[PDB]
Design a protein around this ligand. Structure first.
Ligand SMILES: CCCCCCCCCCCCCCCCCC(=O)OC[C@H](COP(=O)([O-])OCC(O)COP(=O)([O-])OC[C@@H](COC(=O)CCCCCCCCCCCCCCCCC)OC(=O)CCCCCCCCCCCCCCCCC)OC(=O)CCCCCCCCCCCCCCCCC
Ligand SMILES: CCCCCCCCCCCCCCCCCC(=O)OC[C@H](COP(=O)([O-])OCC(O)COP(=O)([O-])OC[C@@H](COC(=O)CCCCCCCCCCCCCCCCC)OC(=O)CCCCCCCCCCCCCCCCC)OC(=O)CCCCCCCCCCCCCCCCC
Ligand SMILES: CCCCCCCCCCCCCCCCCC(=O)OC[C@H](COP(=O)([O-])OCC(O)COP(=O)([O-])OC[C@@H](COC(=O)CCCCCCCCCCCCCCCCC)OC(=O)CCCCCCCCCCCCCCCCC)OC(=O)CCCCCCCCCCCCCCCCC
Ligand SMILES: CCCCCCCCCCCCCCCCCC(=O)OC[C@H](COP(=O)([O-])OCC(O)COP(=O)([O-])OC[C@@H](COC(=O)CCCCCCCCCCCCCCCCC)OC(=O)CCCCCCCCCCCCCCCCC)OC(=O)CCCCCCCCCCCCCCCCC
Ligand SMILES: CCCCCCCCCCCCCCCCCC(=O)OC[C@H](COP(=O)([O-])OCC[N+](C)(C)C)OC(=O)CCCCCCCCCCCCCCCCC
Ligand SMILES: CCCCCCCCCCCCCCCCCC(=O)OC[C@H](COP(=O)([O-])OCC[N+](C)(C)C)OC(=O)CCCCCCCCCCCCCCCCC
Ligand SMILES: CCCCCCCCCCCCCCCCCC(=O)OC[C@H](COP(=O)(O)OCCN)OC(=O)CCCCCCCCCCCCCCCCC
Ligand SMILES: CCCCCCCCCCCCCCCCCC(=O)OC[C@H](COP(=O)(O)OCCN)OC(=O)CCCCCCCCCCCCCCCCC
Ligand code: SF4
Lengths: 59, 64, 283, 63, 93, 51, 142, 161, 67, 50, 58, 72, 132, 120
């Protein structure tokens, strides 16, 4: 059944999250809010526009 | 960018309500039992939106 | 009998409700055991990264560490600070426990293999995340501890970024699947996983995954070094156990969501043999 | 950064290769779209085999 | 001759008991969900919204006929319950 | 109980957003653009009110 | 296969893994092609999106084009004393070229058995659409 | 006849509390540094389940590892009082035990046992990480045994009354 | 830049057949859209409506059913 | 108890019994609404009395 | 990769559209008889209502 | 005597084969009941209407299916 | 009229080739200039004629029982997806059109084709199934 | 979106919480809590807190909150066209791109005036 492979992928992602917790430092709320509202939101919107343009290219 | 100095600092004028601290300051203490206080520092920390405004470091809790 | 039969309709339907309750209780117990095993896995993986054995003397070679942790959190006594509102101090953990055990209803394990026929899984996930954020904020506020309240404020600030980030990720995701259901994402990932399209925003996907699960670098509202403990400064015993369980439930189920919507769902990796795979098999 | 001549040559190499790679990717996407058009044509030819009947609208339906 | 495991393999292998117990619990949970869905339908009923409109009409036509058409076509003025616990309309208005 | 099977098999719609699309992007598109301009001007006015 | 047959869902609810049926179907269609190989009008009626010569040229040139691109890539960017990675990159480029060529060939087959679907007899059409060789027993039995 | 149930559950509760002994992240001095050394890879407290919690509400063990001054004694007393029950106390180091080097000082409590009750004492200055682990393991064994030390006598049917 | 590129490609797709011309410049929408936006429309002038097959008589491939 | 309380109990029992009676015996019992009172057989035709 | 993945997703959607064309043909073959059954049952339930209305309102 | 990968292969096999079987058969010890229900769902000749101008009678069809070893 | 929905779909897939005149008359009677359907009261005679021809077309040949059962099982497990079961439905309709020819069809079967058909649309999903 | 079965599952979750409550009470059998002066007081790292109810925040991110409201509304408005983008036409494409452009313009104006940071 598919949930076997699904559980494998879930375990992989959980291990990745645990390793990242053990690896990376901690951001600041102001720092990440500035990063999200000045860089990442624009990246998301531009990627959405790119996807729309590509879909219109391929119909 | 443009200028944002007025958004960066807030001075106090005599008897000026707007220039005064129009808020109850969060006078929490970075007390001893704190992972970042090394256990023997009582830093009376006056904060304004988690911004460290005033410091009163009580030391001597390990004075021997 | 012809005259005794009418009286028994409802009292005969009641055992079916009892059976449904038993099934739901079994499912909740199993998912709680999954969460406990995930906690043990996290301890062992952090042990691997930090070059230490980890849990090794609870059970034989540390097999029953999670059971011991859960039972200890049961046995730990709880006192409500007399300066705090007792009603809210006890109710907010109960609401968090109720909400965190609604996560497993919004989970797909195959094509239309789920407890309910939820067409709006992403909407349900958003609603449950917002409700748990409400619980965290009120936990910080009603404890009347300054560190806990600052942790609640940090949690609120996260939801400002969490909402935008997750909403834009969903906006970019539902553009392909054209549905909030998780199976519709999987039907498009049999050839190539959707991570291929979003490879340019793979860093942002990592940010979203670590941000919805409140793991580092977005472990804000916990801030072990900065705010002492997180929102649970005044909470011990099974209230803290409920908060920990809610965090790990969110981690597990958002990992499932990410796997379903971006990493093939429940499909084996077929892009590794993409160069050797044909399009059609005619005749 | 005052890069050496070797570093400048490497930068030129990688930027030229990137431009050529982007152009080749766009050309291959054009080809892939054309192949999709061909597949659609093939399937239309298949599916319109025994569906050549066109029934006129009855005269009781007005303009 | 010492045929022992590679050291990186050993180090990463002192997590596989936890991996196995997680897999056992997760397989149990998923199997219980699957069986709870499977038992009433004797199958895995594909979701209603995962079907085309004609398919949706065909799937629920028998339920419509058995639960609403037969009571409506065999209705008598004395069949309705004197209380307000009647059958709710298909479209709640 | 009446079901129009001809319209059912002639219907390719697979989501409930069709009226919303037909509104905000076909007929009420004027009010959609008006609401977009309204939100833009409201953000500008919010910035000015903060200042 | 990525998409399977365009006429059916290849493994919808049951996996059919009969090699004999596939051999019978291939033999039946081979016999059909051989029977009308000398029919000039039927050959004139055969239509395809891509010609056989173009398909063969793409199938035998895309791997070569990919190999040349991989050689260029490993000469420009790879240190020439690292056999494992240089060979892996060259093999990946060659496999990408082979993927392009095999896609060309498979699309040729798809266009062959769909554009000319109206030229098959009724039993052959049924066998092709349903994937069951029992629909045309007179083309593979003897 | 209630002793039939509680005694196995007594054992289960003792095993659970010894398998999840969470001490409070509260250190003062060189003893606190050695305590931190007793957590890292070489001596892994996570093997026995000892993981540090930052708040006394979530801590079972109060590890007084450092010098207690007259400016800190009310703080230690409040930390002990606010720790949720059941709780145990480990005094690590000569300063915590009886003052140690600063026993003849004007601003030293001369032992944390004068302020809060101490369950177990580790003598070194600083105790080695092995000594601290020995103290923690002995405390875990004792608290496992403390739930049933044989206080209740046995009747003619060998059931505790 | 991507928007300009896709618009230029869409205008360059006029060389293809009608089913494969750009959907940007050629509306291909479900039957409800087709009927409502073209009913009593003299600009398109699609003629009568085939109720069973949900298409206008002048639209290509309308009323196509099995032989 | 009380007179009006007994009257209420009688009327409520009458409502309960009448509702269940009309569910059981005045109804096309083709839809499974009452477990353990309707049959659990697997039907073959469209209309089979449960 | 983004452009190629969008192209592949569009190819999958077009293949699904071809399958939808075939399925719609099958449903069209199935349409008239289901519609006839539905219309007959609908008019049977309308004849009873018309008779009831004519008896009550007369 | 045995290489490490052979010794490691035993443990991964012991993890995978039971887990793979359990995932393949969620309804443990009830697949036989499901098969019996599927067999009972098959309509027989009496459960369906049969045309009178039949090329093969019911007995002929049964004999043909027995000859062909059709499991149905 | 007493037949379940999926069996009605299968019998209609067969009967569309033999009820052609009745279906055409019913469709011409129900045509209109709007996607809104015509009142069924105007098409009652044609609908009843179609139902009569369909009932006459529901009497399957005895040799087609196995194919009909396979189609029923596929439609049950697929929750009414005709495309996922077009192969078995086509087998049934080919049996109905010519039974003896279908006897020859069955005689030339393989070992895999002679096994019982068990359907599991979760374990086996196909390739790019939109409705799944 | 669920139904009465979802409501019944919420009830079952409440019953599961009741089970956890029973376990917690049974655990409460196994210890005694001794009344102490500061045991039920606020914890502020070992010293008495100087405030109980008046713990006020500064809320320097109210601009971020209001922009979150507006942009969540905008994304909700963007949802329908993306759900049914396969049927897009010239009008729908123009409207979607113009709406995204307006969102980007609003964000850029917010950036220009330095209202996306903290204030004193
Ligand atoms: C309950 C199930 C059995 C106990 C599972 C929990 C446990 O403690 O197992 C470890 C347990 C002993 O391990 P340990 O002493 O705790 O620590 C070992 C060290 O960590 C050093 O590790 P190691 O090298 O000794 O371990 C190698 C590794 C090799 O295994 C792996 O690598 C698999 C795990 C990783 C998979 C990939 C993850 C990718 C992300 O793990 C194992 O061998 C673990 C046991 C695997 C065999 C038994 C699995 C039964 C599963 C049945 C599921 C049925 C469906 C659900 C119901 O394993 C055994 O006793 C082996 C024999 C089991 C026979 C079972 C017969 C049935
Ligand atoms: C399992 C066994 C896997 C290895 C089998 C072969 C044994 C071996 O010698 O491997 C090393 C060998 C590299 O040794 P080398 O020839 O000395 O390379 C020297 C370096 O290139 C450095 O010299 P270079 O200056 O020529 O560098 C050129 C540069 C040129 O860079 C590029 O061309 C970049 C290409 C970017 C493509 C686009 C990326 C973004 C879009 C997607 O290449 C790199 O920067 C890459 C060097 C590092 C490659 C690492 C490959 C790791 C594979 C995964 C291992 C995971 C193990 C986990 C468990 C470990 C347990 C102990 O690795 C490979 O040949 C590739 C990895 C194996 C692929 C197997 C595929 C099977 C299908
Ligand atoms: C693994 C995970 C961790 C563990 C999880 C465990 C979860 C399940 C826990 C279940 C606990 C059930 C406790 C039931 C106690 C009880 O009612 O005893 C009645 C009764 C005690 O009567 P007694 O000892 O003669 O006392 C009379 C007094 O001297 C004179 O009478 P009295 O008025 O002084 O009061 C007598 C009686 C009250 O009696 C009355 O009020 C009335 C009856 C006596 C007076 C009658 C007067 C005449 C009639 C008036 C009407 O008082 C009690 O029974 C006090 C019970 C206090 C709690 C004991 C258990 C606490 C620990 C377990 C809870 C869960 C911990 C979870 C930890 C975290 C995880 O015990 C029995 O009848 C025992 C019968 C023998 C069989 C015992 C074993 C049966 C089950 C076997 C399988 C067990 C599987 C594992 C469980
Ligand atoms: C007691 C039964 C009373 C009764 O009237 O039963 C008749 C009733 C109806 O019988 P029937 O209509 O004649 O057909 C027989 C089967 O129902 C035919 O069943 P089927 O072929 O439709 O397959 C579905 C069947 C398939 O069921 C199974 O295969 C049972 C085992 C499923 C996997 C469990 C893995 C657990 C792993 C945990 C971690 C290690 O599952 C069910 O019927 C019940 C699903 C819910 C299972 C609840 C939990 C099971 C045990 C795990 C407890 C974990 C606690 C923590 O039978 C059942 O409800 C089946 C037994 C349910 C209880 C199983 C044991 C617990
Ligand atoms: C302080 C409020 C700030 C704004 C809150 C905005 C909404 C936040 C929503 C998130 C959850 C909040 C806590 C929920 C639990 C407490 C309920 C509450 O406030 O009761 C007040 C009410 C009223 O409180 P009261 O009695 O103090 O009010 C009387 C009015 N005064 C005091 C002003 C005169 O409490 C009760 O009625 C108590 C008994 C019923 C309790 C019911 C809830 C218990 C928990 C059950 C599970 C809940 C989650 C279910 C999840 C299902 C799946 C999603
Ligand atoms: C599963 C849930 C089982 C609950 C069992 C009863 C819990 C209990 O005794 O709580 C202790 C409390 C208090 O019990 P207590 O005061 O006797 O506890 C002290 C126990 N010793 C003597 C060992 C220190 O009991 C109650 O509240 C009443 C229990 C029912 C009568
Ligand atoms: C106060 C009132 C507020 C409310 C107002 C509501 C109405 C707003 C106005 C809507 C105007 C719509 C114009 C559509 C654009 C257009 O017509 O572009 C021309 C061309 C299509 O030309 P056409 O002749 O239709 O195509 C050949 C097929 N016959 O189009 C093309 O070639 C390109 C497709 C159209 C444009 C796509 C998006 C481009 C970017 C948009 C702006 C982004 C910033
Ligand atoms: C890495 C991306 C990838 O796997 O691209 C595969 C593609 C090979 O062609 P593909 O579209 O897979 O062909 C199938 C049938 N023609 O690869 C290519 O065609 C390579 C060049 C175009 C894609 C570049 C992606 C970066
Ligand atoms: S006992 Fe010794 S090592 Fe410990 S705090 Fe005192 S001086 Fe330092």
């Amino acid at each position: 059944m598919p949930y076997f492979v699904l559980l494998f992928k879930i375990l992989i992602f959980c291990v990745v999250a645990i390793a990242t917790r053990g690896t990376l430092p901690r951001y600041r709320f102001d720092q990440f809010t500035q990063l999200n509202w000045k860089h990442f939101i624009y990246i998301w919107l531009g990627f959405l526009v790119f996807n729309l343009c590509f879909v219109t290219f391929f119909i | 960018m443009n200028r944002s100095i007025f958004q960066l600092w807030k001075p106090e004028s005599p008897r000026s309500n707007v220039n005064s601290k129009q808020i109850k300051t969060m006078n929490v203490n970075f007390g001893p039992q704190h992972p970042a206080a090394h256990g023997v520092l009582r830093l009376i920390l006056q904060l304004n939106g988690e911004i460290a405004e005033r410091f009163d470091p009580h030391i001597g809790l390990l004075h021997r | 009998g012809f005259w005794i039969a009418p009286l028994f309709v409802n009292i005969l339907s009641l055992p079916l409700y009892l059976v449904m309750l038993v099934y739901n209780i079994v499912c909740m117990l199993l998912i709680t055991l999954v969460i406990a095993s995930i906690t043990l896995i996290e301890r062992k993986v952090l042990s691997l990264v930090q070059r230490r054995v980890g849990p090794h003397y609870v059970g034989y070679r540390g097999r029953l560490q999670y059971i011991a942790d859960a039972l200890k959190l049961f046995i730990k006594g709880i006192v409500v600070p007399e300066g705090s509102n007792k009603f809210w101090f006890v109710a907010i953990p109960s609401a968090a426990g109720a909400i965190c055990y609604t996560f497993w209803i919004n989970s797909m394990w195959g094509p239309s293999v789920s407890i309910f026929d939820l067409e709006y899984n992403l909407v349900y996930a958003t609603i449950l995340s917002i409700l748990f954020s409400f619980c965290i904020m009120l936990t910080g506020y009603f404890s009347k501890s300054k560190y806990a309240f600052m942790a609640s404020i940090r949690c609120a600030i996260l939801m400002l970024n969490i909402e935008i980030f997750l909403g834009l990720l969903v906006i970019n995701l539902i553009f392909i699947s054209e549905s909030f259901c998780f199976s519709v994402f999987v039907i498009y990932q049999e050839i190539i996983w959707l991570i291929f399209i979003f490879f340019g925003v793979s860093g942002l996907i990592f940010i979203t995954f670590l941000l919805e699960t409140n793991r580092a670098p977005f472990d804000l509202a916990e801030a072990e070094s900065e705010l002492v403990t997180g929102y649970s400064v005044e909470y011990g015993g099974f209230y803290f156990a409920l908060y920990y369980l809610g965090e790990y439930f969110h981690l597990f189920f958002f990992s499932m969501v990410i796997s379903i919507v971006l990493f093939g769902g429940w499909e084996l990796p077929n892009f590794l043999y993409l160069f050797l795979l044909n399009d059609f098999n005619i005749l | 950064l005052k890069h050496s001549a070797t570093v400048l040559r490497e930068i030129k190499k990688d930027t030229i290769m990137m431009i050529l790679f982007i152009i080749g990717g766009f050309t291959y996407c054009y080809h892939m779209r054309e192949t999709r058009f061909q597949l659609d044509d093939d399937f239309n030819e298949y599916v319109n085999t025994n569906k050549q009947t066109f029934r006129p609208i009855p005269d009781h339906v007005k303009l | 001759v010492n045929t022992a495991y590679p050291t990186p393999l050993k180090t990463i292998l002192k997590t596989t008991p936890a991996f196995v117990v997680y897999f056992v619990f997760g397989l149990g949970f998923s199997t219980v969900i699957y069986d709870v869905v499977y038992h009433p339908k004797d199958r895995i009923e594909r979701f209603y919204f995962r079907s085309s409109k004609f398919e949706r009409l065909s799937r629920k036509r028998d339920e419509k006929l058995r639960h609403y058409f037969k009571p409506a076509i065999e209705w008598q003025p004395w069949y309705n319950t004197s209380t307000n616990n009647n059958t709710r309309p298909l479209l709640r208005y | 109980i009446y079901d129009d099977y001809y319209e059912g098999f002639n219907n390719s719609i697979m989501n409930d957003f069709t009226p919303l699309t037909l509104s905000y992007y076909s007929i009420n598109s004027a009010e959609f653009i008006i609401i977009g301009l309204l939100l833009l001007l409201g953000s500008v006015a919010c910035v000015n009110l903060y200042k | 296969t990525n998409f399977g047959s365009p006429f059916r869902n290849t493994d919808s609810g049951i996996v059919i893994r009969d090699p004999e049926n596939e051999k019978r179907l291939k033999l039946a269609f081979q016999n059909f092609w051989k029977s009308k190989q000398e029919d000039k009008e039927f050959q004139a009626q055969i239509k395809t999106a891509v010609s056989k010569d173009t398909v063969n040229f793409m199938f035998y040139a895309s791997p070569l084009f990919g190999a040349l691109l991989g050689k260029t890539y490993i000469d420009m960017f790879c240190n020439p004393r690292y056999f494992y990675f240089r060979a892996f990159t060259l093999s990946m480029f060659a496999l990408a070229g082979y993927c392009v060529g095999n896609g060309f060939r498979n699309r040729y087959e798809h266009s062959l058995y769909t554009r000319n679907y109206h030229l098959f007899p009724k039993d052959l059409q049924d066998a092709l659409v349903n994937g069951d060789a029992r629909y045309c027993i007179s083309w593979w039995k003897q | 006849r209630v002793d039939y149930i509680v005694t196995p559950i007594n054992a289960v509760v003792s095993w659970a509390r010894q398998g999840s002994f969470w001490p409070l992240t509260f250190g003062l001095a060189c003893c606190a540094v050695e305590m931190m050394h007793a957590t890292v890879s070489r001596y892994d407290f996570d093997r026995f389940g000892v993981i540090f919690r930052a708040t006394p509400r979530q801590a079972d063990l109060i590890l007084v590892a450092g010098t207690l001054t007259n400016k800190m004694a009310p703080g230690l007393r409040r930390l002990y009082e606010q720790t949720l029950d059941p709780k145990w106390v480990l005094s690590m180091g000569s300063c915590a035990n009886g003052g140690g080097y600063y026993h003849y000082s004007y601003s030293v409590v001369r032992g944390c046992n004068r302020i809060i009750p101490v369950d177990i004492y580790v003598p070194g200055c600083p105790p080695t990480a092995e000594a601290l682990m020995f103290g923690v393991l002995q405390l875990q064994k004792s608290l496992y045994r403390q739930i049933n030390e044989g206080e209740k006598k046995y009747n003619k049917k060998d059931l505790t009354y | 830049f991507c928007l300009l590129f896709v618009l230029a490609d869409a205008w360059g797709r006029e060389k293809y057949a009608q089913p494969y011309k750009s959907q940007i410049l050629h509306g291909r929408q479900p039957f409800g859209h087709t009927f409502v936006q073209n009913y009593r429309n003299q600009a398109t002038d699609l003629g009568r409506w085939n109720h069973n097959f949900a298409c206008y008589e002048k639209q290509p491939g309308c009323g196509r059913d099995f032989d | 108890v009380g007179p009006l309380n007994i009257v209420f109990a009688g009327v409520a029992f009458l409502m309960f019994y009448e509702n269940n009676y009309k569910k059981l015996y005045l109804n096309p019992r083709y839809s499974y609404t009452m477990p353990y009172l309707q049959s659990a057989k697997i039907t073959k035709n469209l209309y089979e009395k449960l | 990769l983004q452009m190629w993945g969008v192209g592949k997703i569009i190819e999958i959607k077009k293949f699904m559209k071809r399958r939808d064309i075939e399925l719609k043909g099958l449903q069209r073959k199935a349409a008239p008889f289901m519609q006839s059954m539905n219309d007959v049952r609908h008019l049977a339930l309308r004849e009873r209502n018309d008779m009831l209305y004519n008896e009550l309102l007369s | 005597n045995l290489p490490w990968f052979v010794r490691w292969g035993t443990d991964v096999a012991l993890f995978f084969i039971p887990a793979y079987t359990f995932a393949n058969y969620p309804t443990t010890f009830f697949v036989f009941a499901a098969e019996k229900r599927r067999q009972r769902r098959r309509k027989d000749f009496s459960d369906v209407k049969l045309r009178d101008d039949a090329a093969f009678s019911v007995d002929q069809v049964k004999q043909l299916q027995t000859k062909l070893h059709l499991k149905q | 009229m007493n037949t379940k929905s999926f069996e009605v779909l299968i019998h209609s897939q067969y009967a569309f080739d033999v009820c052609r005149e009745q279906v055409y008359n019913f469709e011409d009677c129900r045509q209109t200039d709007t996607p809104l359907p015509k009142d069924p009261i105007h098409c009652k005679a044609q609908a009843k004629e179609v139902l009569s021809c369909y009932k006459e077309a529901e009497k399957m040949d005895p040799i087609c029982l196995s194919s009909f059962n396979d189609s029923r099982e596929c439609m049950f497990k697929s929750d009414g997806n005709l495309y996922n079961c077009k192969t078995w439905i086509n087998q049934y309709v080919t049996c109905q059109k010519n039974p003896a020819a279908f006897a020859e069809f069955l005689e030339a079967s393989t070992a895999e084709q002679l096994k019982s058909k068990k359907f599991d649309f979760v374990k086996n999903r196909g390739h790019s199934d939109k409705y799944l | 979106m669920g139904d009465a079965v979802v409501i019944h599952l919420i009830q079952n979750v409440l019953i599961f919480g009741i089970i956890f409550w029973l376990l917690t009470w049974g655990a409460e059998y196994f210890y005694t809590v001794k009344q102490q002066l500061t045991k039920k007081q606020f914890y502020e790292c070992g010293f008495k807190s100087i405030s109980e109810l008046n713990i006020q925040i500064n809320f320097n991110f109210f601009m971020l909150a209001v922009f979150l409201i507006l942009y969540d509304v905008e994304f909700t408005f963007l949802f329908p066209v993306l759900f049914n983008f396969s049927m897009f036409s010239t009008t729908e494409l123009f409207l979607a791109f113009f709406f995204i452009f307006l969102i980007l313009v609003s964000l850029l104006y917010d950036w220009l005036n330095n209202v996306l940071s903290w204030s004193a």
